[PDB]
Design a protein around this ligand. Structure first.
Ligand SMILES: [Zn+2]
Ligand SMILES: [Zn+2]
Lengths: 49, 72, 472, 55, 53, 382, 308, 54, 320, 50
């Protein structure tokens, strides 16, 4: 071959690059209650809106 | 040892032929006697009713050496 | 500057100490000894009750329900030999009825020894409970279950004495006793598990007993423990076609356990996604147990096609665990209703693949990355895997140069700079100036400077040529 | 078959020499002392196989 | 080290459970019936009584 | 310490301090101001007890007790210190009568993991569970129960777990709602939790404890035995009612079996309801206890009948007798697995099949026919 | 040197570093949500809790410390507890009384041990075994008031005795070593530190002010040689923090302690020597035989003359 | 050199929602309570309304 | 620098030196190639009835110079110390001057002298294709030939690493290859001369043509074999690295002795003051100005006069 | 380790089916596209097959 560079990254290399980095838990964005109309914008000052 | 393994397989198939001959005998011949003990309200033990409650006959030619007494 | 690697991950802590793993092992050992102590205390109490009722009540005949409850409590604790003369006496006195026989056969499956084998022996794998309960006298309890089934059918024929040639085979009691027989035969060895859909189902058909949903669920679980998935999926397809309003979650648990045993984990994912889609019947914690154990069994599976060239590949399936847990928060399945071993594996996969927004703002600081490097340098012999060692479909004759005017739109700046002396005989073809062909940012000035330098040295060379050839 | 494995190990003589020196390099970077209580499965003053292990 | 002492404890736990269970089997009745015939034996195989229910 | 309240700051003098200020994180001022401020004390108590922020907590509790949720939320925004547990109790109890579940969940989650587990309390989780009952949200009921059970971090590391009486109250009102609305799996999980924690006779324990508190206020010695628990009105009333519960269960199962045999044909009756799995009840209260222990013995029948007595404070056992019998029979039929296995509809028999000899289709198969369907012919093998 | 832009910009090689090296979480800051105290595991039956509820109200519950004076709490246990006919209820009640007297430092609460529990647990070969909640509370009490009654109870918790030492908290050993260094028991420091080493306790996560107080009270020569070999059992992050803590508690930050330290210079220099070591750099008879024949030779040669 | 995993054909893209197959005998049994589209009862081959009326 | 053994890797003073010299990088930046910008043209330094000296100053980032002697009669040119980052101006100059390149003189085989030698020979032979160019060098520099790769390691010259030097190929002084009977571009280089250290004024010369003689002088101290060129008819002394403007060569490199450098400076006192000395680095001077205004020669002769038997002179910071 | 798994393996080998212990490791063996590309590369664009 002598100079072969792939134009598609192989499935093993994609799997290794996926298996090394964690997930963000807020990416799931699940919601079943509703919006807190009174409290969510008036929470504690360090974590406030 | 390759010869003695064939001595076992011809001796196991002799007994497996005899056990499966008598097991078909004592089941089918007892099917013709028809001893009716349901009126007695017994414990359902019998010659047939222990043979049919026993499992399938594991053949000695099917077994390995450790199932016929050799240590693992 | 030296470039940083963009395909190297950020250094983050995903692991536990040796002390934390040792304390986890110690606490799990303590919980196993506690469950063993509880079962031994309960079994001693049952045997003391039996010795009291056998010694003090030598000639005083007991009421039949006390003996029935004693035989049930004896058979539930795995003491089947101490209960069968009580059942023989109760059947001989004709004190047993339709429900009592099914109660005795269901107690013969020992659901108190099963809890100890679950929490201590099987390490909370529910398939391994069926695999290990066959060791404690599988064939003898199977023979006793068959004998009590015959006793039950004789007493049902007595108790039914129109529909006269179709009794007691058409009643609910025969189907209940057959379901109890299948549930007890699941507990026994592999021969009786294989005989549940083979011999027991054909005998139930030949006797003319109409089955129920528990019959099909136990046949599906027996085929699941056998490893035959096409027949179990055929039975659930039969139930989906005809009696679809009666299907409970035990059939889904049977298919999950069976595809876990047959190691077809994509079918486990398909069954779990279908159960999340339909949301009815409700997912028990056994559903989450079987699905998360199938995930952990697939993630710990080594592969042989890359031959472990870089790392283990299947570990990325543990990234599915923070998804499915969130699905449990939508399904109302409490995650605290998981076993301790599976909770250890789930917290392992969670600290490997989960982060929050507040940690994601601080996890890439150079202090933590260099602490990771220093901790790998100091003690990496303790935590390392290697240190242990037109349209194309209607195109056929393509029309080229269709008078599309490229002079209406403006692309005038197409200037290019070629190196000086391409065909010059005095300038060599090979040279270090060929490296000037790959340079983009300062291309114009480099080409002009190279052309000026080559013109100056060629002019000086021909001037020296003329001066030397005219001086002699 | 015999000569292929004999020729496979002679080309790794120098690479295993440098592998042995790289063992000594990571050895001298280890944490000094008997260790740390965070990274131990065994108490220090006894064998792990001692019958009177947990006091 | 201590491979003999840790193996002797596991053998004596096997012997203590096999001794405490032999005393459970021997002081027990084993009743078998065929057709109303109660043959009662002990753990040692001695026939205690050949009865009829 | 009211005099030493305050924090000193820096001046950013040298070049390295400027480089550190330009390399700081997104929350560096508020984080260091929060951690240089209030923290868990040396003996393990909360930093709640603040002198300067004391009347603001009184105003918040006073506004959340009068029903003013928005004003209490507005002056909750002004807090600097960690607020007390009574703030979260008053806020969640203000969230109960309006069925505002999202505001109560946000109130709990604000102090749950961020503020040293001040809202991880029995009364706050009890009001959260009451909001979940008022909102009829089953998944949030199981969520409140799951955060009540807790994990290793909140129970062992933080040492902030719910007391046993509050856990029993929360699990009992959740189990009451889940049994009232026919949710079998969730009620089975909560009942398995009450079995595992041994809380089946806990209401009797609270009654015996109130009697023993009155006795120890009198000056009499107190103890706990079997006859002390049997002397309460709850166990006596349940034992007196239990034959009516058994007759209701037998009548309801007979009607269910008759409906199953009717629907097995399509309406005449089938032979399905000729002999069912229930036997007849003896004419003795001891025979009633025998029948309930041998046909519904997987669950504790007496504890279920004791739990089903009260409904929203109203004593159903003394006032509405057939309503209480129907409720107790429904709860026993829900929680029992053997009742679920004995009340099954008769299904048709699935026949096996083989592939064709002359393969025409892969879907067309030769079916295995029972000799009941086709009479005659030879006797077949397996 | 670089990558050209007309080349395909594929990934060269994947890097699996977080799955080859699994690192445990280690921050320089301590955990903000830890209890930092001695937990008692109040496991009361849920009938006596409702009965003793006005009496358990004034007692310390989970992460709550009421301001009730201890003379009211001991007076409540003296009168009301013989009315309660349950052994495990009275023992768990006295565990909260010992915990309440520890937080308020009332030295007279050791008479409650001699009144109720001494004759059935720690007198003349008592066969009964006390609950773990009671032994944790009295050992937390004797360490907080600097009582000398810890020694008879700690010797009962060994493997021949009650075997309660594998169930001890890391904060239980932290309050233990701080009291023995305040009283100055050299044998009490060694017997606890030998027990922590044998029980496989978290030696790195002991409180650093507790270790440097217990090490300051080492003056005897035989126990001083024990501390030399024992100090290698700490980690390198711990032993560099013990030097900064020992230098501060004897220097400017000597006001953090209730009682000031005594001047032990031989332990100050050895801890400073040992912390620098763990950190990186920045035949008498036969010999006396030879001496005697040489003096014999110099007298014969004349190098050692006689009187002139 | 082959694979040890389960070999399965890809799932059929034939739309089974609009595929009206041959009527089975159980379908003619349960036709009294069957919900079908207007194409299902008036199919070009095998119409089910004629079977329901027959 | 040198080979990283076990002792060099476990040394903290090595990491301290690599932090002090190069900051937070720790790796030395190499000596790169001069780009096509900021590069000057070839200058004609001297014109004479016999020869023409054409040179280019600062042709490397070592700050070395490149010189070529042209015989006006025979049309033969001679490069001395062939080290130019762009040997394409020189090949075009030779081709536009109708000159023939026959030999390349090498004073010593340090990296500032032989870095682009294969490029010179390849490009000039490729232009000759439209007899090959010989190399004149001293065999003591063999010990500096073998470390051409290592010197290419430390100074970042990676593209010149994997190149067999033409002085290493088989000359007429070496045994010949016994090739299979069934090629001569690299197997044998007949045009190669090895200079001898016994240099005299009688026969140690190269016949450049037209009666011009180039006397090579063996003068160590900066190298084990270091050969100056002396043209007495033109008063031109190609010193190489022995003598510069107001300074002399380094001794703090391997195979460099200070007393050999002192003897090499002492063997230079018989030339006249109007001899233009032409160094390998920097600006050119005269030998009389170096006798009057150079402090290294003053220290050498002062140590010789006060009675030092082993006079050792030499620079420790300067040109390689 | 279980007798259940040994009996299941002997039953499946008597049936003539795949053992579940041979499914312990995953083999994604030789996809058809790689085999076709190796056949074309070995045979120099595979003339005669086109
Ligand atoms: Zn040089
Ligand atoms: Zn030079």
């Amino acid at each position: 071959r002598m100079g072969y560079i792939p134009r598609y990254t192989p499935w093993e290399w994609i799997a290794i690059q996926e298996a090394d980095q964690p997930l963000i838990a807020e990416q799931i964005r699940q919601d079943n209650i509703g919006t807190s109309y009174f409290f969510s914008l008036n929470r504690y000052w360090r974590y406030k809106a | 040892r390759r010869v003695n393994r064939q001595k076992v397989n011809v001796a196991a198939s002799l007994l497996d032929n005899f056990v499966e001959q008598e097991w078909t005998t004592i089941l089918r011949d007892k099917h013709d006697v028809t001893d009716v003990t349901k009126t007695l309200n017994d414990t359902q033990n019998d010659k047939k009713q222990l043979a049919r409650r026993l499992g399938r006959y594991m053949l000695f030619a099917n077994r390995s050496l450790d199932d016929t007494g050799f240590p693992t | 500057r030296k470039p940083q690697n963009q395909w190297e991950g950020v250094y983050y802590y995903s692991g536990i100490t040796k002390r934390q793993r040792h304390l986890i092992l110690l606490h799990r050992k303590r919980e196993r000894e506690a469950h063993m102590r509880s079962f031994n205390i309960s079994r001693a109490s049952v045997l003391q009750r039996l010795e009291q009722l056998s010694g003090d009540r030598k000639q005083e005949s007991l009421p039949p329900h006390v003996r029935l409850d004693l035989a049930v409590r004896l058979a539930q604790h795995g003491l089947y030999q101490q209960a069968t003369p009580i059942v023989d006496e109760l059947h001989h006195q004709k004190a047993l009825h339709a429900g009592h026989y099914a109660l005795l056969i269901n107690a013969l499956a020992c659901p108190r020894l099963g809890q100890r084998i679950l929490h201590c022996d099987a390490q909370c794998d529910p398939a391994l409970t069926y695999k290990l309960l066959g060791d404690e006298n599988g064939e003898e309890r199977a023979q006793e279950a068959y004998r009590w089934f015959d006793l039950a059918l004789t007493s049902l024929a007595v108790d039914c004495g129109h529909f006269v040639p179709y009794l007691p085979q058409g009643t609910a009691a025969a189907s209940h006793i057959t379901n109890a027989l299948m549930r007890t035969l699941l507990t026994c060895g592999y021969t009786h598990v294989a005989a549940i859909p083979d011999s027991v189902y054909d005998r139930m058909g030949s006797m003319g007993i109409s089955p129920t949903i528990s019959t099909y669920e136990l046949v599906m679980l027996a085929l699941s423990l056998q490893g035959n998935m096409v027949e179990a999926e055929s039975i659930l397809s039969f139930l989906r076609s005809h009696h679809s309003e009666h299907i409970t979650v035990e059939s889904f648990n049977a298919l999950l356990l069976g595809h876990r045993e047959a190691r077809q984990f994509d079918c486990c994912d398909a069954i779990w996604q279908e159960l999340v889609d339909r949301r009815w019947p409700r997912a028990s914690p056994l559903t989450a147990e079987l699905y998360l154990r199938s995930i952990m069994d697939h993630a710990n599976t080594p592969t042989s096609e890359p031959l472990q060239s870089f790392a283990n590949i299947n570990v990325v399936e543990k990234k599915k665990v923070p998804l499915v847990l969130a699905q449990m928060d939508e399904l109302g399945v409490p995650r605290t209703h998981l076993s301790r071993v599976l909770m250890d594996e789930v917290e392992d996969s969670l600290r490997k693949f989960q982060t929050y927004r507040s940690r994601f703002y601080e996890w890439g600081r150079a202090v933590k990355q260099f602490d990771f490097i220093e901790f790998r340098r100091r003690n990496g012999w303790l935590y390392d895997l290697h240190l242990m060692k037109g349209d194309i479909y209607y195109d056929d004759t393509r029309g080229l140069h269709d008078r599309s005017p490229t002079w209406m739109n403006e692309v005038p700046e197409t200037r290019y700079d070629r190196l000086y002396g391409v065909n010059h005989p005095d300038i060599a073809k090979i040279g270090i100036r060929r490296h000037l062909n790959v340079e983009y940012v300062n291309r114009k000035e480099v080409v002009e400077r190279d052309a000026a330098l080559m013109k100056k040295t060629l002019s000086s060379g021909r001037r020296l040529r003329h001066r030397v050839e005219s001086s002699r | 078959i015999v000569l292929n494995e004999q020729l496979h190990t002679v080309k790794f003589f120098d690479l295993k020499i440098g592998d042995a020196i790289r063992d000594i390099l990571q050895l001298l970077q280890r944490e000094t002392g008997v260790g740390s209580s965070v990274n131990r499965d065994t108490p220090v003053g006894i064998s792990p196989n001692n019958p009177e292990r947990r006091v | 080290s201590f491979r003999y002492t840790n193996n002797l404890i596991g053998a004596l736990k096997h012997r203590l459970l096999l001794e405490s269970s032999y005393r459970e089997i021997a002081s027990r009745k084993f009743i078998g019936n065929c057709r109303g015939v109660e043959v009662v034996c002990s753990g040692y195989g001695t026939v205690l009584a050949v009865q009829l229910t | 310490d009211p005099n030493r309240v305050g924090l000193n700051a820096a001046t950013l003098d040298c070049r390295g301090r400027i480089y550190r200020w330009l390399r700081r994180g997104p929350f560096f001022q508020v984080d260091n101001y929060f951690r240089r401020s209030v923290k868990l004390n040396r003996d393990g108590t909360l930093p709640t007890d603040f002198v300067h922020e004391a009347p603001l907590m009184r105003k918040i509790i006073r506004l959340a007790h009068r029903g003013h949720l928005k004003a209490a939320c507005e002056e909750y925004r002004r807090v600097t210190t960690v607020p007390p547990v009574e703030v979260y109790r008053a806020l969640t109890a203000c969230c109960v009568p309006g069925a505002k579940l999202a505001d109560a969940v946000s109130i709990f989650e604000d102090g749950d993991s961020k503020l040293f587990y001040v809202s991880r309390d029995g009364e706050v989780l009890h009001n959260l569970m009451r909001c979940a009952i008022a909102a009829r949200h089953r998944a949030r009921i199981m969520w409140v129960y799951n955060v009540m059970r807790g994990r290793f971090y909140e129970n062992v590391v933080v040492r902030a777990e719910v007391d046993l009486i509050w856990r029993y109250r929360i699990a009992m009102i959740a189990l009451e709602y889940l049994l009232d609305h026919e949710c079998a799996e969730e009620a089975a999980a909560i009942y398995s939790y009450l079995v595992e924690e041994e809380l089946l006779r806990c209401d009797v324990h609270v009654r015996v404890g109130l009697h023993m508190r009155e006795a120890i206020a009198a000056g009499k010695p107190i103890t706990l035995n079997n006859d002390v628990m049997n002397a309460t009105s709850l166990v006596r009333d349940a034992t007196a009612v239990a034959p009516e519960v058994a007759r209701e269960l037998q009548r309801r199962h007979a009607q269910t079996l008759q409906n199953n045999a009717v629907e097995a044909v399509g309406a005449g009756s089938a032979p399905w309801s000729i002999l069912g799995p229930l036997t007849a009840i003896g004419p003795t209260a001891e025979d009633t206890m025998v029948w309930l222990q041998q046909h519904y013995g997987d669950v504790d029948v007496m504890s279920i009948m004791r739990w089903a007595r009260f409904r929203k404070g109203k004593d159903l056992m003394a006032k509405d007798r057939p309503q209480y019998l129907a409720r107790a029979a429904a709860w026993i039929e829900l929680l029992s697995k053997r009742n679920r296995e004995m009340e099954e509809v008769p299904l048709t028999y699935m026949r096996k099949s083989k592939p064709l000899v002359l393969d025409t289709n892969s879907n067309v198969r030769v079916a295995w026919q029972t000799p009941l369907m086709r009479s005659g012919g030879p006797p077949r093998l397996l | 040197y670089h990558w050209h832009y007309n080349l395909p910009q594929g990934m060269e090689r994947p890097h699996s570093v977080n799955r080859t090296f699994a690192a445990p979480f280690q921050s320089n800051h301590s955990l903000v949500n830890k209890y930092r105290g001695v937990w008692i595991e109040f496991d009361m039956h849920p009938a006596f809790s409702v009965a003793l509820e006005p009496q358990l109200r004034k007692l310390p519950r989970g992460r709550t410390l009421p301001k009730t004076p201890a003379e009211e709490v001991i007076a409540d246990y003296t009168a009301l507890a013989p009315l309660v006919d349950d052994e495990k209820t009275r023992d768990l009640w006295l565990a909260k009384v010992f915990q309440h007297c520890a937080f308020q430092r009332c030295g007279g609460a050791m008479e409650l041990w001699e009144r109720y529990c001494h004759q059935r647990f720690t007198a003349e070969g008592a066969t009964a075994k006390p609950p773990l909640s009671l032994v944790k509370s009295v050992l937390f009490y004797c360490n907080k008031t600097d009582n000398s009654g810890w020694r008879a109870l700690f010797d009962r918790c060994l493997k021949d005795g009650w075997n309660y030492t594998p169930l001890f908290d890391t904060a239980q050993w932290s309050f233990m070593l701080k009291s023995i260094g305040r009283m100055g028991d050299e044998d009490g420091v060694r017997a606890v530190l030998e027990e922590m080493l044998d029980v496989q306790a978290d030696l790195d996560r002991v409180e650093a002010r507790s270790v440097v107080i217990a090490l300051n009270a080492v003056t005897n020569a035989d126990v001083y040689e024990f501390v030399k070999k024992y100090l290698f059992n700490f980690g390198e992050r711990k032993v560099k923090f013990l030097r900064t803590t020992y230098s501060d508690l004897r220097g400017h930050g000597a006001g953090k302690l209730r009682i000031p330290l005594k001047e032990n210079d031989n332990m100050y220099y050895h801890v400073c020597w040992h912390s620098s070591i763990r950190s990186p750099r920045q035949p008498n008879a036969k010999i006396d035989d030879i001496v005697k024949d040489k003096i014999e030779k110099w007298k014969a040669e004349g190098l050692l003359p006689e009187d002139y | 050199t082959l694979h040890n995993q389960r070999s399965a054909a890809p799932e059929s893209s034939v739309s089974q929602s609009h595929t009206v197959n041959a009527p089975t005998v159980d379908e003619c049994e349960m036709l009294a309570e069957r919900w079908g589209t207007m194409n299902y009862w008036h199919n070009d081959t095998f119409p089910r309304l004629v079977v329901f009326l027959k | 620098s040198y080979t990283p053994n076990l002792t060099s890797l476990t040394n903290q003073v090595n990491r301290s030196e690599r932090l002090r010299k190069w900051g937070s990088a720790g790796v030395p930046p190499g000596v790169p190639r001069i780009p096509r910008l900021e590069a000057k043209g070839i200058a004609i330094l001297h014109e004479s009835p016999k020869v023409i000296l054409a040179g280019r100053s600062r042709c490397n980032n070592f700050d070395s110079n490149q010189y070529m002697l042209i015989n006006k009669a025979t049309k033969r040119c001679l490069l001395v110390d062939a080290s130019d980052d762009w040997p394409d101006d020189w090949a075009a100059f030779i081709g536009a001057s109708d000159l023939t390149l026959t030999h390349v003189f090498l004073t010593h085989c340090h990296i500032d002298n032989i870095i682009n030698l294969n490029a010179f020979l390849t490009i000039c032979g490729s232009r000759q294709k439209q007899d090959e160019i010989g190399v004149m060098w001293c065999p003591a520099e063999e010990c500096w030939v073998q470390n051409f790769k290592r010197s290419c390691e430390r100074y970042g010259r990676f593209e010149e690493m994997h190149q067999v030097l033409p002085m290493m190929c088989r000359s007429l002084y070496t045994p010949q290859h016994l090739v299979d009977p069934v090629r001569n571009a690299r197997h044998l280089r007949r045009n190669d001369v090895l200079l001898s250290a016994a240099t005299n004024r009688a026969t140690s010369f190269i016949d450049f043509g037209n009666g011009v003689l180039l006397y090579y002088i063996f003068s160590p101290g900066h190298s084990p074999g270091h050969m100056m060129l002396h043209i007495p008819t033109e008063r031109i002394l190609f010193s190489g690295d022995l003598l510069f403007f107001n300074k002399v060569g380094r001794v703090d490199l391997p195979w460099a002795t200070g007393v050999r450098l002192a003897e090499s400076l002492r063997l230079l006192e018989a030339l006249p003051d109007n001899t233009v000395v032409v160094p390998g680095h920097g600006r050119m001077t005269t030998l009389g100005r170096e006798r009057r205004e150079n402090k290294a020669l003053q220290q050498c002769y002062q140590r010789q006069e006060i009675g030092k038997q082993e006079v050792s002179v030499g620079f420790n910071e300067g040109y390689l | 380790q279980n007798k259940f798994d040994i009996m299941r393996r002997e039953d499946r080998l008597s049936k003539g089916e795949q053992d579940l212990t041979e499914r312990n490791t995953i083999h994604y063996g030789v996809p058809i596209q790689q085999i076709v590309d190796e056949f074309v590369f070995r045979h120099r664009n595979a003339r005669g097959e086109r």
